[PDB]
Design an enzyme around this catalytic site. Structure first.
Site, PDB file in Angstrom:
ATOM      1  CB  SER A   1      -0.922   0.011   1.222  1.00 50.06           C
ATOM      2  OG  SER A   1      -1.738   1.168   1.236  1.00 50.06           O
ATOM      3  CB  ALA A   2       1.096   4.033  -2.431  1.00 45.93           C
TER       4      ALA A   2
END
Lengths: 217, 217
Positions: free
Chosen positions: B9-10
């Site tokens: 997840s960025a």
């Protein structure tokens, strides 16, 4: 200060209410995306992203992205009245965090999904109303907002509308002109009416929203 | 403090770098999304939007939306070190405005278009690579970022990375694992390498990004 905008634009209306809240007078400059006003020389020179709204401070300082502008207006122009700034943009890390959260929710979710569902129906090719997936996803954003408002007067809590209320107030007013039935979400509906009745500039919001409705006929 | 997240997840990675920047240790709580871990009672109870990442402070305070968290971490935990806070989150209204602008640009544009183009290919209905419209729109976001970086070391200016650099650094690292050729944008490429080389937690970012690559293979 110079304000390049468009009446039907929700972001622009968000900035308009905020400016009114802090007693700033904006020098309205209609940036009709006609002739490609945004892709125009002078403008692109200010905002390379040619996005609207765009604010140009007295020092020529250029700013775009409504929510960033909202904060700017409070921090630089509303702060003379410390009571106001604190009301619109709470300084407590926890309270401010919630405000920020809502602001991000507004761009990335609430308005994002609104547009993703309607823009295809009102612009470009104009699609025969709907795309079920995007409709549910959009309605889901409203469910979220409805929950945020559960037992709360304002979107980010607190005792007075914040920058977040104005931003979302702009988005939601767009939902209405779009013809969506907000009665389907008691809290949103309740909040909407109430807030629209006590917020500075609510009048330009409603009026500008109506203009946007031009697309929904 | 409790940090519900996912490596690839960025947004989560953005928060991870920020936490490292301010010397905060997060006791990670891997929240598998594949299995509605974010959809069960306990969680929804904290974040009704069940979105990730989600942060729970020492006293039960819940926060989500990476960018809001980034600001929170600096304001509440990085501040003990004034110079640190001012470096990552400049207090000058104009400077901060640019930071904010970039943060919004990141959610609403840079990552938004990245996902809109790739998600249809590596998620749900793995569409046979591409949708030209979304590709141009995505590359346009890169052109903008490239322009923002023209003659600038950091995305929001200044002589030190800010919260904005870390956020976009997470997004862009995702672009790379996705296989897009960033060499096509000198400034972005230049900024990326450099920044990834001096930022706290950068490793975790490259690695988590790599995990996300799982989807692109």
């Amino acid at each position: 200060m110079d304000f390049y905008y468009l009446p039907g634009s929700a972001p622009c209306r968000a900035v308009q209410m905020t400016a009114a809240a802090v007693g700033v007078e904006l020098n309205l400059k209609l940036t009709n995306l006609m002739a490609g006003e945004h892709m125009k020389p002078e403008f692109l020179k200010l905002n390379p992203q040619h996005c609207i709204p765009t604010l140009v401070d007295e020092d020529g300082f250029v700013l775009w992205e409504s929510r960033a502008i909202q904060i700017y207006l409070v921090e630089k122009y509303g702060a003379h009245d410390a009571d106001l700034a604190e009301r619109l943009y709470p300084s407590d890390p926890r309270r401010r965090a919630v405000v920020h959260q809502r602001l991000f929710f507004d761009v990335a979710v609430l308005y994002q999904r609104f547009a993703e569902y309607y823009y295809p129906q009102i612009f470009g090719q104009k699609v025969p109303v709907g795309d079920p997936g995007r409709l549910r996803s959009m309605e889901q954003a409203l469910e979220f907002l409805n929950t945020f408002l559960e037992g709360e007067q304002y979107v980010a809590g607190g005792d007075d509308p914040t920058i977040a209320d104005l931003s979302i107030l702009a988005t939601i007013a767009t939902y209405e002109v779009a013809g969506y039935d907000l009665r389907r979400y008691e809290n949103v509906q309740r909040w909407y009416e109430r807030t629209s009745a006590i917020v500075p500039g609510a009048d330009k919001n409603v009026e500008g929203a109506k203009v946007f409705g031009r697309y929904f006929t």
